[PDB]
Structure 1
Amino acid sequence: NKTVVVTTILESPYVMMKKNHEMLEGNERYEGYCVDLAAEIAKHCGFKYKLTIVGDGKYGARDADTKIWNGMVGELVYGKADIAIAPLTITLVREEVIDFSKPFMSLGISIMIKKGTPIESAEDLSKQTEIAYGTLDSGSTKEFFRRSKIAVFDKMWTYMRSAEPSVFVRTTAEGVARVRKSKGKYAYLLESTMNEYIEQRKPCDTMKVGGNLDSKGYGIATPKGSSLGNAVNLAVLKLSEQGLLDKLKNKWWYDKGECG
């Protein structure tokens, strides 16, 4: 009976540092959707755990030259952590090297603009140059554009891969800050979950425009063949059926909304 090392990532409102965190220790420093979900998963599977924030601050991508994985994915693949409880997107390239539970949350890539920016769709972003746009580094959104053979998205990638200065950001907070200070000349492509949360926070100057560009899910990840996987998957399905996932989403998005 070992303490399970949980890798996760600081990403609002999934895992955030509490306001008084420097006077707090271990798991108690953090709050958020995935902090509550970790507690619930651990209860139903019956383990003790330690939240650890991923060292390199990344979700996970595979370097094309070395084939080495970074981020939470790489922590699971190289045996640093036992489980990933995070907004980690289920993808085919990841599923090849790690296991995922059934999804605990739905999402899709979406567009974030500063309010009043004259963009309504991906198609709109793609037909112009005045408004720059990009995605997070080392995540599933960047890859979706990398891999897309849909004309509008292919054309969006061609611009993004070569744009100068770089349109890509290391963190969601960086991308969001860029939107907010670019006076409508930078739009950010990010997952609808993160977009809708931000929209409901002060200074209330961003919005999600248009529909989602895809539809997919976050799952709880474990190293390939790990013994936790079966229990974690049953636990996710249980929490889904009890209504707890829905309770948590409302708690962290809509109950803590501050743009009325």
Structure 2
Amino acid sequence: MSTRLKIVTIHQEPFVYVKPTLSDGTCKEEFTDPVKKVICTGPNDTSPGSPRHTVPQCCYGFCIDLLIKLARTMNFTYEVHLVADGKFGTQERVKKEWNGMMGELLSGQADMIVAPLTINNERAQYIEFSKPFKYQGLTILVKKGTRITGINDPRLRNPSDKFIYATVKQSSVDIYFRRQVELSTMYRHMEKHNYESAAEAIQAVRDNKLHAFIWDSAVLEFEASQKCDLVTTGELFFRSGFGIGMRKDSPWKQNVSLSILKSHENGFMEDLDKTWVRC
């Protein structure tokens, strides 16, 4: 007996902060106004091909504030968990299979995806995306001192083992560089250096391991505003939106979108942007 919604999310600052619980299994009461926090069960152990031990964790950020607003608006009960494999989600050949939160949602392990999940053709062929709650693009994260003109820079268009540039494995950035033949040369360099997570990639730019990180501007711009040793370069390419993901059959699809439109019109979405996003 349960008409409670299974919500899947991923660790992605500043949208989803993931921190451990206190010694009693509760969240450290923080303040912006109180910081609204949820219990999010997830694997404590990263690394591929390793056993995943589900532990309660604390979840907060732009997307959590958004979920709470969605639950209160549509009158739904929910429970939150982090994506077991730590990925956003691509369709790979095994017969083809979706991995990450995409795989999770399509199998019924999740009833909803609440994360900075990019709306794209490949995913929209299989799932329902709400109206976007954020419009953003792709940019490049370099170390303060590195110079690049953008996506048309010869250090990227003409790759070499000298300058290492990557993205996140099983992400939409991976889907974009793979689908486009005009970027096949760049995709061939990237495939060898792609990280399991954006945090790992961001740290690798801090530790001189990675020299350029092609990622979502909403995340890169936020990162550059905190970590002054890193800066974003060039304008925005593949301008895309972030949306809520549901199965095509979902009875919440029309109401999820109306709530998002409401929040854009009444300033709520601009509030989240001020609270969580905006050297």
After TM superposition, is the score higher than 0.5? yes
Provide the C-alpha distance between the structure 1 equivalents of 2:235 and 2:22, rounded to a whole number of angstroms: 37
**1:165-215 Cα shifts (integer Å, max 9, x gaps):** x310000011101111117x621110111101111113x211110011211
SS at match of 1:120: coil
Question: Deviations for 1:6-37, whole angstroms, at most 9, x for unmatched residues?
Answer: 11111111111247655416825211010100
| 3-state SS of paired residue (1:142) | helix
Q: Counting strand residues as a fraction of each chain, which structure ranks higher?
A: 2
1:8 aligns to what?
9
Matched pairs, number: 247
Counterpart AA for 2:226: R
| 1:29-108 correspondence to structure 2 within 5 Å | 29-108=58-137
More helix by share: 1
SS at match of 1:122: coil
Aligned partners of 1:98 and 1:224 also within 8 Å = yes
For structure 1, the 5+ residue unaligned runs are none
Give the Cα separation in 2 of the matches to 1:120 and 1:140.
23
Q: Does 1:133 align with 2:134?
A: no
**Distance in 1 of aligned mates of 2:266 and 2:178:** 38
Partner of 1:218 in structure 2? 242
Q: What is the percent sequence identity of the aligned residues?
A: 34
1:192 to 211, 217, 225: 217
Secondary structure at the aligned position of 1:119 is classed as coil
Tell me how far apart the structure 2 counterparts of residues 83 and 251 of structure 1 sit (CA, whole Å): 24
Match of 1:179 among 205, 212, 234: 205
For the pair 1:116 / 2:145, whether they are aligned, the reply is yes
**Are 1:24 and 2:5 an aligned pair?**
no
How far did residue 62 of structure 1 move?
1.2
What TM-score results when the alignment is normalised by the length of structure 1? 0.89
**Shift, 1:149, TM fit:** 3.0
Taking the aligned partners of 1:145 and 1:169, their CA distance within structure 2 comes to 15
After superposition, the CA RMSD in angstroms is 1.8
The amino acid across from 2:218 in the alignment is: T
Are the structure 2 counterparts of residues 20 and 133 from structure 1 closer, same or farther at C-alpha, using a change threshold of 3 Å? Answer: same
Deviates more, 1:26-35 or 1:172-181: 26-35
Instruction: Find runs of 4+ consecutive structure 1 residues off by over 3 angstroms.
Output: 18-23
- Whether the 8 Å contact between 1:21 and 1:30 is mirrored in structure 2 is no
Residue aligning to 2:184? 154
Structure 2 stretches of 5 or more lacking a match?
Answer: 28-36, 40-57
Please give the alpha-carbon distance, in whole angstroms, between the structure 2 residues aligned to 1:45 and 1:239: 13
Q: 1:228 is matched by which residue type in structure 2?
A: W
1:199 alignment partner AA: A
Using the TM superposition, give the Cα deviation of residue 93 of structure 1 relative to its aligned residue in structure 2, in angstroms: 1.1
Query: Aligned partners of 1:19 and 1:59: how far apart in 2?
Result: 22
Shift, 1:3, TM fit: 1.3
Report the AA paired with residue 13 of structure 2.
S
| TM-score after normalising by structure 2 | 0.83
Tell me if 1:170 matches 2:181.
no
* Cα distance in 2 for residues equivalent to 1:18 and 1:43: 24
2:217 maps to a residue whose letter is: S
Contact 2:87–2:101 under 8 Å retained in 1 = yes
Measured after TM superposition, the shift of residue 120 of structure 1 is 2.5
Moved more, 123-132 or 187-196: 123-132
Change (3 A) 1:146 1:128: closer
> Once structures 1 and 2 are overlaid, which stretch shifts more, 242-251 or 19-28?
19-28
SS of 1:118's equivalent in the other structure is coil
Does the CA-based 8 Å contact 2:140-2:150 persist in structure 1? yes
Q: Tell me the alpha carbon deviations over residues 121-158 of structure 1, each in whole angstroms, 9 at most, x when there is no partner.
A: 122222453321011000100110011133xx333123
For 1:234 and 1:127, locate their aligned partners in 2 and report how far apart those are by CA, in whole Å: 45
